[PDB]
């Protein structure tokens, strides 16, 4: 049938409506089947079950500015919360494009996991992906390149080997053992479980946690 095991694909999180880089692990039946996929860089989530609807062949082809026509549904990067920043990958129908001397302006209606979002100013016009349509093209069986996702930091430049205090631990600057990296519900700064002067031994089951700076 359609998608095979080991095949690299994109899994759409029905909640936020975004597409994530994943890989098929198993395929069961209830084209009405269940896809058990694992996310490349989300091991803490393990295997996840997906409807055939929320699974497509891994994106690979980039549509450059010149070939972007209005009314063309594609997959681009957008950050609904911080539009001026890099976000995640959603489906969108390009509404209009406007090129001047200072910038190529791309506008599209970003589709989310509940309802559309009309007339969004797409920042990354060079990173537009063509949606692989079921059947057309070959299956992705070889480990492909990585799309850049998640907001970037202008203090360490997202360089893994660099210690930061804005995107990493507000205290030391490390970036390891991230599931123990408490995040204050006030200044959004990260604090390791084992860094602040009474080192906590576990995760505060309490919904909120306000760091020392914020009491």
């Amino acid at each position: 049938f359609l998608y095979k095991v080991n095949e690299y694909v994109d899994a759409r999180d029905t909640n936020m409506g975004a597409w994530f880089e994943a890989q098929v692990v198993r395929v069961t039946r209830k084209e009405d089947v269940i896809y058990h996929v694992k996310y490349d860089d989300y091991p803490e989530n393990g295997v996840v079950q997906m409807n055939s609807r929320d699974v497509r062949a891994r994106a690979r082809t980039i549509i450059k500015w010149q070939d972007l026509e209005v009314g063309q549904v594609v997959m681009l990067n957008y950050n609904p919360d911080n539009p001026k920043e890099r976000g995640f990958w959603y489906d969108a129908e390009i509404s209009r494009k406007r090129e001047t001397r200072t910038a190529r302006e791309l506008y599209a209606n970003v589709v989310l996991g509940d309802d559309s979002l009309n007339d969004c100013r797409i920042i990354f016009v060079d990173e537009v992906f063509k949606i692989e349509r079921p059947g057309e093209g070959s299956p992705m069986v070889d480990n492909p390149m990585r799309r850049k996702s998640g907001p970037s930091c202008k203090h360490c430049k997202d360089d893994v080997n660099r210690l930061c205090r804005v995107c990493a631990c507000h205290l030391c600057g490390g970036r390891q053992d991230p599931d123990k990296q408490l995040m204050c519900d006030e200044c959004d700064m990260a604090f390791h479980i084992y860094c602040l002067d009474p080192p906590l031994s576990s995760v505060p089951s309490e919904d909120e946690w306000y760091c020392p700076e914020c009491r």
Partner: peptide
Amino acid sequence: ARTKQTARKS
């Protein structure tokens, strides 16, 4: 409680 691993998917 929000850990950096949890708040990833905004």
